[PDB]
Amino acid sequence: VMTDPIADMLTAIRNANMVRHEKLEVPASKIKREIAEILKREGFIRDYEYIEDNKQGILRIFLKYGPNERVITGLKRISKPGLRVYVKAHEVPRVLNGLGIAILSTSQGVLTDKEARQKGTGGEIIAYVI
Amino acid sequence: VMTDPIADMLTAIRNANMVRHEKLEVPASKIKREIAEILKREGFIRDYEYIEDNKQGILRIFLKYGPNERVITGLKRISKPGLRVYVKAHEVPRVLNGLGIAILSTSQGVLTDKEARQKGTGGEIIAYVI
């Protein structure tokens, strides 16, 4: 993978969350879709859908707000050019409940720190969400 | 892997260590030879050799003693029927220096706890030596 397009997606979600948008759109890709599935699965966004516009693939993300407040507190792109963050299977962080989610790019795909541990794999930490 | 023949090999080493014999011989096997290598590599035994006697593979193990004192303090078979000890890659023990070595059967072969961590694998803990 490459974290630049990932930084782009995260920046857009960040910005949309600030001004409280109900949705946002970003060019689709497999990894971006894998990230959206995780955010959705972990209750950070409400939903997402793949859409095509002028034959261009797009991911439409629906943000989630509790009774007026933002559900996403922060999103950060981690491993990046010049500052790679790789972790062996044994070193995948055990992230406490309530402290967020680490997203790893692994040989078995994009997984959360919790999935990586159950699957017994390490990988590149590409993002953190809280 | 089957642990009984491992128990049997470790028992013979323990007995020979108690009365302070220079060496012992046990029927050879892949796993048994793998344990011998690790024991030799980790400084617990002096050396070992494979020979075929009357068309039967034999592992001759040479014990090590400091100026008369024992080098092996304890060695036992761990995972066994009714007491299986399995560890995921993330939970492979971090054995401090001076506390011994855990030996596990992994999909990548018989490895010490340190090698399993380095290789990104979990497994069944078959023996422990201190």
From Swiss-Prot, chains A, B:
The lineage of its organism: Bacteria, Bacillati, Bacillota, Bacilli, Bacillales. NCBIfam families: PRK00136.1. Disulfide bonds: none annotated. One of its GO terms (cellular component) is ribosome. This is Small ribosomal subunit protein uS8. Part of the 30S ribosomal subunit. Contacts proteins S5 and S12. It comes from Geobacillus stearothermophilus. One of the primary rRNA binding proteins, it binds directly to 16S rRNA central domain where it helps coordinate assembly of the platform of the 30S subunit. Keywords: Ribonucleoprotein, Ribosomal protein, RNA-binding, rRNA-binding.
